[PDB]
RNA sequence: CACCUCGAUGUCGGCUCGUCGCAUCCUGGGGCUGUAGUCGGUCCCAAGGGUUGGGCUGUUCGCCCAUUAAAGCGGCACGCGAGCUGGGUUCAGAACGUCGUGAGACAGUUCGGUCCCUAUCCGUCGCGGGCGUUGGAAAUUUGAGAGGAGCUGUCCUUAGUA
RNA sequence: UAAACGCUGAAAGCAUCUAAGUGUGAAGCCCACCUCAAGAUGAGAUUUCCCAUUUCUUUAAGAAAGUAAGACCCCUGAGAG
């Protein structure tokens, strides 16, 4: 889990979502694309 | 399972294997429970035992009148257990050291040795100060605090009176119970001077 | 006196808000004063006056 | 002419009402509640003479907490101790001890002296609908509209 | 395309009954409750059941939606259960089953014994393959990811609890 | 910067006593890994507790020795001198280098050099008296609330197994 | 409960830990363990004891004077100070 201010999907499979009120991408493939917005 | 009884001193015991342990004789001449408390009239389940017969003359009429009951005589120490079933023990029902058994772990309670105003040393066992070096600050409670509360927070632990204070010691060990002579041998030492109160229960922690 | 006109104002169906509007609307000049004193004690006088700020409200 | 009515201490006659806090918001509730405590809505209010009447709360634990209150409020107190902090959230006062809730709530609205302390002993805060006052013979207030 | 308004059938002899809320599903398998929110409309006809919104806002369609869902969970669920097929892998990993209680051997220096709902059951038709059958969709997952979650797989080796077919990726640990 | 203090708010370091923040040193939970395992790296949650004994120097700092799970970083008048010390820095003596024609001085060193106060109030730690608690008494009690405690190593086994 | 991981699930036919619904999850929070604690003026509860006296004022929750149950003064002391 990357958390950090700017997440934005790194690959074609990253998806954006919104959980709990914060930001957060979701990449099937490439588990290292997994980012929070903190 | 509990039980009322007076510190009657220490001594040591040889067990089997010939090891040599430390045991304080507590005697307790068979408690009796003098009132149930339970839910419908006090709100909470409790016995109510009372210890150490009194002579009549040291007793009050209502303490005899609440005594009648039990049908004994006044009795100098009274105290409830709770945590313990109230189907099994009725007014006037005896409570003798045989309730524990060798080996049981139990609590003990007493009130500790009082020792009157002592310094900050001796009470929370703080630090001294030098000696010598031109020190003048020897026996003497550490500073008070910060500046800027322009207080001193509560807690600040300074001389006073030490002890007199309920003290429980847990998980002791009953290492004898003698029932002619209604006393318990309880490996290590309890809380209080001799001739005081105790109060063996079973241990909570178990 | 606001506030015990308030109260029975409340009471007659109103605010004091309302009621001093209406009072205004029907040309009634009774201060504070003596609309707190009527409140408290000519509980009629005062629901009588309340009457007449409701119907100029209403016209 | 110095005729301003004042109201004396014990001439006042003081009822008794039920109020019914079923998914009524904490503060509105309390803000109606305290007002009557005080007598606000009697014609005889006199700051300096208690004359509110006596308020009966019930079903307190079904009072309603509007947004994330219910886990976001929180209630801290200070036990004058270094480090002495403690909170408790408003859904878990509601759930355990809803009492405390309405009477922290309405101490919080009346005024902060001998008279309002006072006017305070007279709230009687209950989970449930039933009440161990009726020989008072309190009545039903509505607050539907006062809300 | 929307969930909330596609119909749901009712095959073979399963059976609904419903009330303000707490519409039950009962057939075969068995019987489930659930308290459907009272905004949704439902419709029943003989084997047909609609769900209707009352306009489109945001909150309509993601209820709309769910709540068909659910209700078609629970006809699924009466009529053929659901069910999690586990295929745990190593060396010497193995499970079996005393009646509700699930005993996993997966490496660890004890076993891990696990115990079904009432609306659940174990297969076990092998010590290494484990299937979770039950009625309820959602505790049918829980109990699966429970097991899974006992020692979940690992990339290197692949070692640990799977769902039956669920990719895992592998890194080529050195 | 010069807004309080020059009809005085005592300055470094140490000692005694701590308390708080979390940007976490250890311990706890977790994600990613260029995570095989043992170790780790990075990030997320976490302030409950713990977080050393010396050599040198007035020292803080720092280096070193030897340990530890760890040897956290900060605030509180760089916390704490009506609580202590007074080694350093600012008095009067003396001397060296240096500057000055000089008295003297530091762009520097060196040896020696007075640390007062009976606690009124609040605050803090203990202990009494009065009255209240709605008849007067003797005991036993519930717990609103509050404090305390909260750490951790190594070895054996599981297993020389994964 | 935190971080984190979910299950079911639409909004958004898919997907999705979340919106509704449901669960796991820390030396941390509330309990659990120890102690203080009804001046908790919100002054709580239980058991036991005493008994409705006398005199005068006044309808007074009046006043004072003997008492009961009980407590204390005083005296011998310590396990207390
Ligand atoms: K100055
Ligand atoms: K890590
Ligand atoms: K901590
Ligand atoms: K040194
Ligand atoms: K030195
Ligand atoms: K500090
Ligand atoms: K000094
Ligand atoms: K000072
Ligand atoms: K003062
Ligand atoms: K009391
Ligand atoms: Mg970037
Ligand atoms: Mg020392
Ligand atoms: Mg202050
Ligand atoms: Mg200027
Ligand atoms: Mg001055
Ligand atoms: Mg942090
Ligand atoms: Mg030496
Ligand atoms: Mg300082
Ligand atoms: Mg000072
Ligand atoms: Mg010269
Ligand atoms: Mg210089
Ligand atoms: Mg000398
Ligand atoms: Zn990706």
């Not at chain 2, 006044?74 to 257990?81: A, L, T």
């Not at chain 4, 859904?91 to 009346?110: A, C, F, H, P, Q």
Request: glycine share 10%; charged share 25%; with cysteine.
């Amino acid at each position: 889990m990357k958390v950090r201010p700017s997440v934005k999907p790194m690959c074609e499979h990253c998806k954006v979502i919104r959980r709990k009120g914060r930001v957060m991408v979701i990449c099937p493939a490439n588990p290292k694309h997994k980012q929070r917005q903190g | 399972k509990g039980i009322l009884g007076k510190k009657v001193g220490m001594t040591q015991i040889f067990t089997e294997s010939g090891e040599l342990i430390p045991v304080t004789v507590v005697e307790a001449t068979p408690n009796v429970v003098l009132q149930v408390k339970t839910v419908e009239t006090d709100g909470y389940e409790a016995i109510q035992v009372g210890y150490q017969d009194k002579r009549e003359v040291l007793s009050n009429k209502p303490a005899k009148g609440h005594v009648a009951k039990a049908n004994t005589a006044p009795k100098r120490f009274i105290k409830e257990f709770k945590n313990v079933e109230l189907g099994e023990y009725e007014v006037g029902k005896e409570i003798k050291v045989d309730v524990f058994q060798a080996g049981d772990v139990v609590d003990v309670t007493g009130t500790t040795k009082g020792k009157g105003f002592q310094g900050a040393i001796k009470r929370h066992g703080q630090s001294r100060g030098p000696m010598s070096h031109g020190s003048r600050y020897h026996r003497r409670p550490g500073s008070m605090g910060p500046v800027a509360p322009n207080r001193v927070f509560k807690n600040k632990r300074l001389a006073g009176r030490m002890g007199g204070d309920r003290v429980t010691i847990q998980n002791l060990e009953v290492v004898k119970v003698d029932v002619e002579r209604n006393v318990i041998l309880i490996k290590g030492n309890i809380p209080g001077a001799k001739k005081s109160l105790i109060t063996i229960k079973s241990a909570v922690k178990a | 006196w606001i506030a015990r006109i308030n109260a029975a104002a409340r009471m007659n169906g109103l605010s004091y808000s309302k009621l001093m509007h209406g009072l205004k609307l029907a040309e009634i000049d009774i201060n504070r004063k003596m609309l707190a004193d009527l409140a408290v004690n000519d509980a009629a006088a005062f629901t009588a006056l309340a009457e007449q700020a409701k119907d100029a409200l209403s016209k | 002419m110095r005729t301003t009515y004042m109201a004396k201490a014990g001439e006042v006659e003081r009822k008794w009402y039920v109020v019914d806090a079923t998914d009524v918001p904490l503060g509105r509730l309390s803000a109606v509640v305290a007002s009557v405590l005080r007598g606000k809505n009697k014609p005889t209010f006199t700051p300096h003479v208690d004359t509110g009447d006596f308020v009966i709360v019930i079903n307190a634990d079904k009072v309603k907490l509007t947004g994330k209150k219910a886990t976001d409020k929180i209630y801290y107190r200070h036990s004058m101790y270094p480090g002495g902090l403690k909170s408790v959230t408003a859904g878990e006062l509601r759930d355990k001890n809803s009492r405390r809730l309405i009477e922290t709530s309405v101490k919080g609205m009346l005024p902060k002296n001998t008279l309002g302390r006072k006017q305070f002993t007279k709230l009687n805060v209950y989970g449930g609908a039933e009440h161990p006052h009726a020989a008072q013979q309190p009545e039903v207030l509505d607050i539907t509209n006062l809300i | 395309s929307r969930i909330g308004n596609k119909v749901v059938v009712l095959p073979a002899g399963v059976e609904i009954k419903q009330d303000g809320n707490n519409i039950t599903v009962k057939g075969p398998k068995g019987e489930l409750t659930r308290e459907f929110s009272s905004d949704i409309k439902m419709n029943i006809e003989g084997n047909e059941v609609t769900f209707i919104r009352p306009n489109d806002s945001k909150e309509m369609k993601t209820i709309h939606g769910t709540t068909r869902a659910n209700f078609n969970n629970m006809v699924v669920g009466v009529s053929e259960g659901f069910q999690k097929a586990l295929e745990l892998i190593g060396v010497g990993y193995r499970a079996q089953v005393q009646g509700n209680k699930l005993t996993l051997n997966v490496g660890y220096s004890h076993p891990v014994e696990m115990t079904a709902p009432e609306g659940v059951t174990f297969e076990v038709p092998a010590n290494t393959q484990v299937i979770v059958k039950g009625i309820n969709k959602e505790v049918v997952g829980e109990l699966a990811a429970n097991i899974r979650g006992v020692r979940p797989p690992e990339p290197y080796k692949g070692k640990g609890i799977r769902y039956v077919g669920e990719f895992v990726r592998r890194k080529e640990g050195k």
